[PDB]
Design a protein around this ligand. Structure first.
Ligand SMILES: *[C@@H]1O[C@H](CO[C@@H]2O[C@@H](C)[C@@H](O)[C@@H](O)[C@@H]2O)[C@@H](O[C@@H]2O[C@H](CO)[C@@H](O[C@@H]3O[C@H](CO)[C@@H](O)[C@H](O)[C@@H]3O)[C@H](O)[C@H]2NC(C)=O)[C@H](O)[C@H]1NC(C)=O
Ligand SMILES: *[C@@H]1O[C@H](CO[C@@H]2O[C@@H](C)[C@@H](O)[C@@H](O)[C@@H]2O)[C@@H](O[C@@H]2O[C@H](CO)[C@@H](O[C@@H]3O[C@H](CO)[C@@H](O)[C@H](O)[C@@H]3O)[C@H](O)[C@H]2NC(C)=O)[C@H](O)[C@H]1NC(C)=O
Ligand SMILES: *[C@@H]1O[C@H](CO[C@@H]2O[C@@H](C)[C@@H](O)[C@@H](O)[C@@H]2O)[C@@H](O[C@@H]2O[C@H](CO)[C@@H](O[C@@H]3O[C@H](CO)[C@@H](O)[C@H](O)[C@@H]3O)[C@H](O)[C@H]2NC(C)=O)[C@H](O)[C@H]1NC(C)=O
Ligand SMILES: *[C@@H]1O[C@H](CO)[C@@H](O[C@@H]2O[C@H](CO)[C@@H](O[C@@H]3O[C@H](CO)[C@@H](O)[C@H](O)[C@@H]3O)[C@H](O)[C@H]2NC(C)=O)[C@H](O)[C@H]1NC(C)=O
Ligand SMILES: *[C@@H]1O[C@H](CO[C@@H]2O[C@@H](C)[C@@H](O)[C@@H](O)[C@@H]2O)[C@@H](O[C@@H]2O[C@H](CO)[C@@H](O)[C@H](O)[C@H]2NC(C)=O)[C@H](O)[C@H]1NC(C)=O
Ligand SMILES: *[C@@H]1O[C@H](CO[C@@H]2O[C@@H](C)[C@@H](O)[C@@H](O)[C@@H]2O)[C@@H](O[C@@H]2O[C@H](CO)[C@@H](O)[C@H](O)[C@H]2NC(C)=O)[C@H](O)[C@H]1NC(C)=O
Ligand SMILES: *[C@@H]1O[C@H](CO)[C@@H](O)[C@H](O)[C@H]1NC(C)=O
Ligand SMILES: *[C@@H]1O[C@H](CO)[C@@H](O)[C@H](O)[C@H]1NC(C)=O
Lengths: 433, 48, 79, 193, 48
């Protein structure tokens, strides 16, 4: 059997989209612009626009719900601790800096730098667009065609406050605030409990506290440095942003397509043709642009279904990795999950999963059971291994040999049944007396 | 202008909404109902 | 609510009857700002929510959303 | 008619190699290779550990090792025999294949539909009618066939979403049932996994 | 209380789709075949 003799603390980043842009369409604006004749013809054609806007408004409310379900999982907004060091574990990077004006943590600043969000803010005044016509801004072009993006209900500052509260709660209370009332606990004791929660005795954590804290800090610094680079770590969130922008921009560009009409320019049609022929051509254009809007809304619904699946998974991760220690394999980072931290990112979340990775395996000769006198003793909690001269009982995930004794073994049956039983001696604690 | 007329059981026009009077009337005409529930609703972009 | 109008100081609005004021979501007209924070009833956006409250008569009041009940739960290392 | 199927990146041999590696790892190392470095362990002791997992002591596995091995072998032989017949056990995969084939074939067949045009045969239209009238008819046909392609793509997107949910669940099952023992009820088979 | 005295080792099959066929469409080929006039008309119509 191969038994690890050492371990590492690994911190891995998991990027998850949580929401996408909330959009609405002025159907009349997109299809007809400022033409009265086209507006009357669109009325006569039939109002499919109410259905489109119902779907889009459902999507927007869904986006707000996604964000709330992921981040608003704390009853009380726990205050950021004055000191960012807990038993040697340095939380400074993942908690807001009191001095700086950002109000978000340093890692959050890096993450928000990685993703390019196109326009900042959701307000674009009419005078602004009219004063910079020479720069063919995309946002002005799509606002002039009835396509608007609505701000998320929770601002970046509120999401950062939620993240700070979650981090502070896990630092001060731990897992206890996800079930009932937050119960305070020293961070080292919480780490000892979470070590016990992956089959490693608390003795390992307490007796190597400083080394483990250094490993955790070094992992934090390494994630920080890797993020402090032009790498495409947040490619998923950037992909979401790009998808939204591209959908709106292709909607804007599709206005140039003749749909069997003599031209795609409404003003040209109305200037050349009288009511009847103009009505024919404009009916063709209305059909085409309605189809464009319907395709946009269908694709938005499908993308929103995918994003909702991602948001539900992110909420599950926040519940099972941040508010508690998950025993599911490869759910909260790769390895024996110890804990996790959330960090807000544009349109999503980033989980820093802290896991225990065993290493430095040593080979030993093992035995399924031990025959003593005429009975078969079994490891109970542990496994038998041969150290070279004497047999010991050790926990599986960390080589800590212990003298084999009745306390750590339980007897069952005789030695005949056991297949690969090994002859050995089992001490008894009462032997001292 | 656009109006939303109401025909009652006997087929007489008993009420109407003028869609261009104010944003609330526009919302009523868009949703096709004289009764609007509590909340916030997107309406037409500011027209001049 | 006009998302693309600044009314901090003719505006592109409908009537501007009264209680005109600016929020992160845009120019809100017809609501009385209150500095108290409640739970969100009608989400306006950008952290702003509206509700129907008795006013110093009942009226529409806009305010900043309450994220939750702030608590201390101070950290300790031996308790 | 312009519809092509692209080969999967991983060949069937490569997928079989992945499966063989997974089976060999669980046989030799067990669950330890899903977390860190694969740790070797005799299969009987791995069985004892997994028996302890479901609340049954290890002596139950060790003292009934031959009987349990025979039961496992007989179950393997029974699944082999059940698969050897002409049953519909793999109805889901056959359904996926049939859905893909049917979608492509209906796309092919929809080319016969007039969409308000005098004919669905483009060559006939271009042989009878001059540029303008032919343009009208061909515009009708173009609208119809674009609608057909859009419908195919939308249905493909919805089916792909369903397949992605299935594949995510399959990856979760691979992680929690193959690379480890799941305590979730009725997630990895019916019974104590 | 009822306590089991024996047990069985059951092996059950779970069939899970993982992937579907990857497909691509030559839009011009499907809509127009090998007609040049139809290709020009499709260009004029718009590239969806
Ligand atoms: C396991 O191996 C580590 C060293 O392994 C390397 O460093 C680790 C921190 C991880 O990054 C590993 O992935 C990496 O391979 C041994 O620890 C070494 O010695 C000491 C004692 O363990 C470590 O910290 C010490 O902690 C206390 C408090 O300060 C004091 O003893 C020392 O001052 C020292 O800081 C030290 O960081 C580490 N050396 C290095 C270069 O990192 C460790 O002993 C071994 N396993 C066990 C069970 O001890
Ligand atoms: C909406 O409008 C308000 C108020 O109107 C502003 O002032 C008018 C005189 C015109 O010039 C308007 O075009 C202009 O918008 C804007 O508030 C203004 O914000 C700016 C940027 O933060 C402030 O400038 C700063 O002010 C101090 C003192 O200098 C320092 O932070 C900076 O050095 C910088 O100068 C400006 O003082 C402030 N004005 C008022 C009256 O509060 C607002 O930005 C604008 N847009 C919105 C709200 O989205
Ligand atoms: C539990 O019951 C089993 C028998 O039950 C039946 O067989 C099992 C293997 C499972 O498939 C059950 O679902 C099924 O109902 C007892 O062990 C089995 O009993 C047989 C028959 O008595 C034993 O005989 C073995 O095989 C043949 C036929 O008798 C002979 O050559 C040998 O004597 C040999 O022992 C057999 O050991 C065993 N089955 C095996 C090894 O495959 C079992 O005793 C009982 N519970 C306990 C706790 O023992
Ligand atoms: C917890 O980790 C943070 C990492 O952000 C530590 O803060 C960092 O501490 C180092 C060492 O003191 C600072 O480096 C110093 O920076 C300037 C020059 O840039 C100057 O003071 C020194 O020459 C030195 O290089 C670093 O700036 C600082 N970073 C921040 C963002 O404040 C913090 O000390 C750690 N806490 C504990 C208790 O270990
Ligand atoms: C451990 O293994 C040795 C060596 O055999 C290997 O491992 C076995 C479990 C099996 O998989 C063999 O095919 C492997 O080659 C076992 O030694 C066997 O035991 C017999 C009887 O004592 C001995 O005479 C033979 O040399 C070995 N037979 C074979 C076919 O290798 C040993 O018994 C195993 N020990 C335990 C406790 O299971
Ligand atoms: C009109 O129909 C009503 C019954 O329909 C109801 O009342 C309508 C005015 C309208 O509001 C509908 O949507 C309602 O469902 C008739 O009302 C009665 O009419 C009889 C004579 O037929 C008269 O004696 C009663 O007082 C009326 N009131 C009630 C409560 O029934 C009404 O007569 C119809 N108008 C006519 C016949 O001219
Ligand atoms: C085995 O145990 C003995 C007990 O004294 C110890 O001295 C020795 O270092 C251990 N290691 C090996 C490889 O035998
Ligand atoms: C263990 O000791 C017994 C006598 O106590 C002996 O008969 C038996 O052969 C020994 N087992 C092994 C595996 O050597």
């Amino acid at each position: 059997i191969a038994i690890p003799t050492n371990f590492s603390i690994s911190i891995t980043t998991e990027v998850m989209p949580v929401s996408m842009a909330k959009t609405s369409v002025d159907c009349n604006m997109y299809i007809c612009g400022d033409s009265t004749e086209c507006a009357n013809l669109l009325l006569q054609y039939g109002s499919f626009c109410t259905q489109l806007n119902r779907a889009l408004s459902g999507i927007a409310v869904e986006q707000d719900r996604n964000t709330r379900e992921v981040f608003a999982q704390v009853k009380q907004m726990y205050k950021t601790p004055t000191l960012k060091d807990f038993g040697g574990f340095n939380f400074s990077q993942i908690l807001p800096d009191p001095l700086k004006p950002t109000k978000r943590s340093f890692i959050e600043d890096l993450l928000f730098n990685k993703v390019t969000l196109a326009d900042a803010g959701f307000m674009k005044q009419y005078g602004e667009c009219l004063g910079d016509i020479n720069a063919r801004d995309l946002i002005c072009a799509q606002k002039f065609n009835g396509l608007t993006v609505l701000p998320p209900l929770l601002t970046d500052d509120m999401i950062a406050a939620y993240t700070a509260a979650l981090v502070s709660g896990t630092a001060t209370a731990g897992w206890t605030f996800g079930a009932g009332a937050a119960l305070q606990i020293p961070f080292a004791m919480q780490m000892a409990y979470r070590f016990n929660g992956i089959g490693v005795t608390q003795n390992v954590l307490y007796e190597n506290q400083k080394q483990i804290a250094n490993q955790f800090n070094k992992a934090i610094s390494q994630i920080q440095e890797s993020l402090t680079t032009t790498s495409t770590a947040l490619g998923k969130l950037q992909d979401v942003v790009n998808q939204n922008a591209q959908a709106l921009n292709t909607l804007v560009k599709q206005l140039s397509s003749n749909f069997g009409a003599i031209s795609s320019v409404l003003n040209d049609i109305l200037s050349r043709l009288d009511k009847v022929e103009a009505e024919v051509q404009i009916d063709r254009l209305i059909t085409g642009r309605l189809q464009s809007l319907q395709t946009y809304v269908t694709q938005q619904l499908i993308r929103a279904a995918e994003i909702r699946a991602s948001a539900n998974l992110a909420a599950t991760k926040m519940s099972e990795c941040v508010l508690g220690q998950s025993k599911r394999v490869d759910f909260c980072g790769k390895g024996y999950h110890l804990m996790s931290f959330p960090q807000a990112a544009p349109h999503g979340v980033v989980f820093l999963h802290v896991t225990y990775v065993p290493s430095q395996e040593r080979n030993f000769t093992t035995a399924p059971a031990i025959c003593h006198e005429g009975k078969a003793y079994f490891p109970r909690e542990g496994v038998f291994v041969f150290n070279g001269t004497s047999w010991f009982i050790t926990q599986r995930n960390f080589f800590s040999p212990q003298i084999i004794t009745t306390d750590n073994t339980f007897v069952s049956g005789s030695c005949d049944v056991v297949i690969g039983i090994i002859n050995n001696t089992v001490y008894d604690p009462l032997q001292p007396e | 202008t656009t109006f939303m007329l109401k025909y009652d059981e006997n087929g007489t026009i008993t009420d109407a909404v003028d869609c261009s009077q104010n944003p609330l009337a526009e919302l009523k005409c868009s949703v096709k109902s004289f009764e609007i529930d509590k909340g916030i609703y997107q309406t037409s972009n500011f027209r001049v | 609510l006009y998302q693309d109008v600044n009314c901090t100081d003719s505006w592109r609005v409908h009537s501007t009857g009264n209680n005109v004021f600016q929020t992160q979501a845009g120019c809100l007209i017809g609501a009385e700002h209150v500095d108290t924070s409640y739970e969100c009833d009608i989400p306006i956006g950008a952290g702003i929510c509206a509700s129907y409250h008795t006013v110093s008569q009942k009226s529409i009041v806009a305010y900043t959303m309450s994220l939750g009940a702030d608590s201390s739960i101070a950290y300790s290392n031996n308790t």
